[model samples]
Structure formats: C-alpha cells, structure tokens
Target: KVFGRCELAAAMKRHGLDNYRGYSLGNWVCAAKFESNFNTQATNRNTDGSTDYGILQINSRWWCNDGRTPGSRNLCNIPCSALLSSDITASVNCAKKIVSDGNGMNAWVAWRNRCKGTDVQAWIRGCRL
Candidate 1:
C-alpha cells in the first residue's frame, strides 16, 4: 500500500536501488511487482513453514526473523516486521547483501520466473527516472 509504479521507482532510485549489486533497476522493480504488487506489508507463507516479507518478499528462512522461527541467520539483523514498513531502506540494503552473496535477482523466485529474459522495461515505462 505504499506506492504506485512511478513513485516506487523514484523512491528506489533515490535510495540508490536504480542499479545496485550490478543488477538493473528494472529487475528489482519487476520482482517487487510480482512479489508484493508494491505493497510493503505483503507476506507469504512458504510450504516449508517459512514466510516471505515486505515489498521485496525477503525470506524468513535466511534473511530475517519472524519471531516463531527458531534459527534465522538474520544477516540483516533486522526484525522481519521492519521490512513491512513503507520505508524500504532496510529491505533494499538487505537485498543488496543477498545479491552480493551471489544470487543476484535469482534469489527472488518471482524474478527468476517472470523477469529473467523477459521485457522488464515496461515495469518502469512511464516513470520519470
């Protein structure tokens, strides 16, 4: 419930997400769209009992703690609730670390399925970068 496409793009760019970890802005934007539809409070429970959180849908399995989870690496050292906020600064930073860890945008299954080799340009087509 935080943004439309253009506003999200502008905010992301302002936060240096236009191009971070050598990935394109379009990739991130595309992933965000499918993962959360730009809603910061989005959450999805996986079959394995883990959950994804935020606009980025960061995994509770590895990235953040969901309180009920027993052991989370919490590399971001942040509560999963933090990612649920309209402010995506912490989420973006954690995603950068994830990309740096070598997954690139592939860490997001949505990106892998929908954005890879797809026409990602349309995600930001009318946006003023």
Candidate 2:
C-alpha cells in the first residue's frame, strides 16, 4: 500500500519514531522517502545479495531474514515478508532495532546520501502530531 506523506508521518509517529534514537520524525520520513516512498509493498534487491523490504527498506542482510540472503544475521528475528504487509508495525520495529544496532541513521544509504544534513523537516510539513 502507498501512503500519503503525512499519513506515513502520522503512522510512524504513532509507532514512536518522532524522537527515536535522536532522529527526528522528519529525518525518518526523509529516509523513507528516499527508500520506498512510503510504499508498504516495495522491495529492492541489492547487488550485495541483500534485499531491502517495505517502507524503511529494511534489509535482509542484518535485519529481516528472507531465507535467501546468504549468511544473514537475521538480527531482527523476523521474516522479510513481514515488511511487505500493509501493517507497518513489524517494519517499524525492525527499523528501530536496525537503527539502534547501527549506531546511527547512516544504516540506510538513502539517509546518508539524501537525508543526512538536509532540512528534513520539510518532509513533514503540515503534519499534525
């Protein structure tokens, strides 16, 4: 399912990402924009054999296990398929864990290349709560 920008923002905020791990809601929204454009069914296969799944584009390498990526750590302890569901709870949870383990939002290349150092607040303009 595709989410409107503010709808995605509100959903994420409801999941406690507003000030999660020192990253603001805008920062997270910005990363999501560059990742999957808030589409819950999006999947992107990486050249490194890891596939990114869902809105945050959680990866198969360290987070969700697709049972296909070789030597996956499966640190999130959930199937990658969970990320594809319309309900974003699993994606949000896995994303929190991934970000926590990575020590920064830089875990997402999209965040580093596009979101980082940008005025991400623009992503949530007019978003309530």
Candidate 3:
C-alpha cells in the first residue's frame, strides 16, 4: 500500500529515526520517497541479481537474506520479507545498523543517485510535525 509522505515521516519519527545515525528526518523521508515511493512491499530486482526490499529498499546483497539470493551476507540478520510490511520497525532497525556501519545513506543507491546534495525538506512539506 502506498503511504503519504507525511504518514511516512510520522512513522519514521515514531520509530526514533527522525535524527538517528547522524542523518536527518528529511534525509530518511526523501530516501524513502525515491527508494520505494513509500510502498512497504516495494521490491526491485537489480541487474546484478540482488533485490531491493521495502520502504527503504534494503538490499539482499549486504543486508537482508531472501534465500533466493545465495551467499548473501545477511548483515542485518533479517529475512527480506520482514521489510516487505507496513510495519517499519525491522526496516528502521536494519537501516540504523547499516548506517552505523559507516556507509551512511550512501548505502542506498536511490539516495546517492537522487537525494544527495539536494534540498530534501520538500519531502516533508506541509507536514505539521
């Protein structure tokens, strides 16, 4: 199901991701928008054969394990389907772990390709938070 940007932001904030890991709430919101368009079940198979999962599009390459992707590092110790849900607790926790490992938001290709260096406040426009 698709969620509004405000709803996404609100969820992120509630999850304590508003300003965790040195990234701002806007950064998370913007990355979510570009990564999966706020759809929790969003999945995309990359040309490299790995898949991106959930609102944050955590990857099978280094994060969650989908089983289909053999040799997955599974650093987050989460099943890929865990991210494909309306409940973002798993996703947020995994994301925090990922950023804590030092990649920051650069771990997300969407953020690197789109949100980096851009004004991301527009992602939360009109949200009375």
TM-scores for candidates 1 onward, in order: 0.94, 0.95, 0.94
lDDT of 3 by residue, 1-129 (tens): 688999888989999887797778889998998889899999999887899999999999889899887777899898999999888999999999988887788988888989989988788889978
Q: Each model's C-alpha lDDT?
A: 0.87, 0.91, 0.89
Candidate 1 at 128: error in angstroms? 1.2
The C-alpha stretches of model 2 lying farther than 4 A from their native spots are none
> How would you encode candidate 2's per-residue C-alpha lDDT over 1-129 as one tens digit per residue?
999999999999999999899999999899988899889899998999999999999989888889899988888899999999999999999888888885689888999999899899999998887
Please list the residue runs of candidate 1 whose C-alpha ends up more than 4 Å from where it truly belongs after superposition.
Answer: none
A best-first ranking of the candidates according to their TM-score comes to: 2, 1, 3
What lDDT is obtained when candidate 1 is compared to the true structure?
0.87
Flag clash pairs in model 3: none
Instruction: Tell me how many clashing residue pairs each candidate has.
Output: 1, 0, 0
Off by over 4 Å in 3: none
Residue 35, candidate 2: C-alpha displacement in angstroms: 0.3
lDDT of 1 at 85: 88
Candidate 2, TM-score vs. the true structure?
A: 0.95
User: Please, what are the lDDT tens digits per residue for candidate 1 over residues 40-129?
Assistant: 999999888888999999988899988866665788888999999888898888888888887788888899999999988788898889
Per-model root-mean-square deviation over C-alphas:
1.1, 1.0, 1.1
Which one is best on TM-score? 2
